[PDB]
Design a protein around this ligand. Structure first.
Ligand SMILES: *[C@@H]1O[C@H](CO)[C@@H](O[C@@H]2O[C@H](CO)[C@@H](O[C@@H]3O[C@H](CO[C@H]4O[C@H](CO[C@H]5O[C@H](CO)[C@@H](O)[C@H](O)[C@@H]5O)[C@@H](O)[C@H](O[C@H]5O[C@H](CO)[C@@H](O)[C@H](O)[C@@H]5O)[C@@H]4O)[C@@H](O)[C@H](O[C@H]4O[C@H](CO)[C@@H](O)[C@H](O)[C@@H]4O)[C@@H]3O)[C@H](O)[C@H]2NC(C)=O)[C@H](O)[C@H]1NC(C)=O
Ligand SMILES: *[C@@H]1O[C@H](CO)[C@@H](O[C@@H]2O[C@H](CO)[C@@H](O[C@@H]3O[C@H](CO[C@H]4O[C@H](CO[C@H]5O[C@H](CO)[C@@H](O)[C@H](O)[C@@H]5O)[C@@H](O)[C@H](O)[C@@H]4O)[C@@H](O)[C@H](O)[C@@H]3O)[C@H](O)[C@H]2NC(C)=O)[C@H](O)[C@H]1NC(C)=O
Lengths: 322, 318
């Protein structure tokens, strides 16, 4: 009887706060797939879109009459819940996916507006040779008046045309991004750029400025390494790179493989920190697969930095096999 | 042989933007108990709610019953900050739990954080501590009050308290509480409670040991080759990875003695691509040191390592 087919639905319940309104020390999320026509079912949990380890959750399926029911429970620390991460219950049933998401409920009062202004990245300055700076305005209330965002130079010389994006966010706020192309000689020779943000509902105008970092210079050292093969790493292995003793701290790190620049999401790179003596260091970690090194067994860690000579780059290769 | 009832309340979640749904369900669960007479009653600010507002049902599996009751509230009532109590009467005796909407997490822009003990303090020094940090307070009058307690109500020791005004005009308050080694390992919950004169209600943070799976770290240690112009220095790098949970301590040793903490730097734990976390540790060394003895030890202390919560790896310059 195909007329009796009952598709699954998804809802998430959570641990309640106590009689004082306070979070418990751990949070349970309970994904409920109510009565559906019995069939093969799998539940995957996502943390900000990344698959979570199945070890962190349980799952149970019962059948009552002609209908099945499945629940999965995920447990989180209070610290992680307070970090405003979003969790997704992803249900796969007979080749069709359902899902639902949740995060900590929003606070009763809205946050004030904030603004951020970046310097150009070394990769854009020296590889692409098309540098830009970005002014980012967050926590705006939508459906108000549109926000004015104006660029100027301390020298009084003209700015180029910028591009502007406005995007409604899941939490109901608005973000505005403005990206300004800058002259390469202008930037290297110390020009100061300002982003000025105004709106009638703001208390005052917001102003941010940016300019090349002053002070001493020093070129980066680069070292690439591979972890050994062992029973836990037969068809994957971990590569690492240490980049150190450079100044100032602005740097771009990439990994290259078989004439491809790998996506930024493939690796994890730390924030620049001070060496005991002079300069900064960063570490980068890249997990690679057997199919990649069977394609070509050469992985390159590359740093882009203004003091690297002769062409603002330093790089080192590593191989995983003999 | 007897399994008493327990009470827990679950509620409708907010969506991916943190928004409330049109109605709020509260679900009172009495799961896995020796069968007997049972009633579930809901109170709103201590008064019995109409019988038609909730439905209870009971099932049995093996030697144990389970009971649940669901109450539906309007968004407006939930947001009014009323207290809802699930009152369970089993064999004539009463068990209660209560809930209300979660209080703001960053009232007036403040943040508060509460740590777990470091593994070195817990397993090596056997003097574990936890730390409660409150940031972005106003430099107003009226001292910020910070109080410690255990979920079990057992006593706590005195704590430290430190304030200092920051360069940005804010005030941070920090307190560190010593905890019992056995008390922590057996799963006690510790609570930090902060009251400021300008805050409308008390702010609380709670911490306890992890409830997830455990996995010991892998430890790998490397020495940099000589870089042109730096004959008398080398850098040692240690990668520690795939451990769970994320709490970890890192030490370096040379000549059987532990080096001062100021000698090295360790990154904060970050997720791998799959299960577990990694950190990097960095140690600069001198020619005098490796010519004296060319062996340096990167040691990790972690609750999942056996038999003594330690895993380590040595490295040599040559
Ligand atoms: C409602 O929801 C929205 C989101 O949906 C949320 O909005 C976020 O709000 C927070 C703050 O409230 C914003 O966080 C800030 O982001 C700033 C911008 O960061 C991006 O751009 C950086 C600049 O990149 C350019 O320049 C560099 C340098 O030259 C160059 O390398 C680049 O190539 C590029 O050209 C970039 O560095 C950054 O990437 C880093 O950070 C991410 C995330 O941490 C990390 O994953 C990367 O690996 C990389 O390390 C990112 O791409 C940022 O500058 C700013 O940082 C300042 O503040 C923090 C703490 O606040 C300090 O620690 C730091 O030192 C700086 O002082 C801050 O992180 C975030 O961008 C919003 N997200 C949006 C708009 O999508 C609202 O808050 C929500 N509201 C409520 C009420 O809930
Ligand atoms: C004004 O300026 C102040 C600076 O003075 C800004 O305050 C900082 O704000 C940021 C962001 O809000 C804070 O970052 C947060 O820090 C949390 C604490 O991390 C620190 O402690 C961790 C735990 O170590 C303790 O506990 C272990 C185990 O018990 C023990 O071994 C130790 O003894 C320690 O006692 C460390 O892991 C960590 O490295 C830090 O040392 C952190 O947990 C959060 O995730 C978050 O990163 C920062 O701490 C604030 N700094 C200060 C000094 O208050 C403030 O934001 C500025 N205001 C504005 C408006 O910008």
């Amino acid at each position: 009887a195909s007329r009796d087919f009952t598709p699954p639905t998804v809802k998430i319940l959570q641990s309640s706060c106590d009689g004082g309104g306070h979070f418990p020390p751990t949070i349970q999320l309970l994904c409920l797939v109510s009565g559906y026509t019995p069939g093969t079912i799998q539940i995957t949990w996502l943390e900000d879109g990344q698959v979570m380890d199945v070890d962190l959750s349980t799952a149970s399926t019962t059948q009552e009459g002609e209908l099945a029911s499945t629940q999965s429970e995920l447990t989180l620390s209070q610290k992680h819940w307070l970090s405003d991460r979003t969790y997704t219950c992803q249900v796969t049933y007979q080749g069709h996916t359902f899902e639902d998401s949740t995060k900590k409920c929003a606070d009763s009062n809205p946050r004030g507006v904030s603004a951020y202004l970046s310097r150009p990245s070394p990769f854009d300055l020296f590889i692409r040779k098309s540098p830009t700076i970005t002014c980012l305005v967050v926590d705006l209330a939508p459906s108000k008046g549109t926000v004015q965002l104006t660029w100027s130079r301390a020298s009084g010389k003209p700015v180029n045309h910028s591009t502007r994006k406005e995007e409604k966010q899941r939490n109901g706020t608005l973000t505005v991004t403005s990206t300004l192309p800058v002259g390469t000689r202008d930037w290297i020779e110390g020009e100061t750029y300002q982003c000025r943000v105004t709106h009638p509902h703001l208390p005052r105008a917001l102003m941010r400025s940016t300019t090349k970092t002053s002070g001493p210079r020093a070129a980066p050292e680069v070292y690439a390494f591979a972890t050994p093969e062992w029973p836990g790493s037969r068809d994957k292995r971990t590569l690492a790179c240490l980049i150190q003793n450079f100044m100032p701290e602005d740097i771009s790190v990439q990994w290259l493989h078989n004439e491809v620049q790998l996506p930024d999401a493939r690796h994890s790179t730390t924030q620049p920190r001070k060496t005991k003596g002079s300069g900064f260091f960063v570490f980068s970690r890249l997990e690679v697969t057997r199919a990649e090194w069977e394609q070509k067994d050469e992985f390159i860690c590359r740093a882009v930095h203004e003091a690297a000579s002769p062409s603002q780059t330093v790089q080192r290769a590593v191989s995983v096999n003999p």
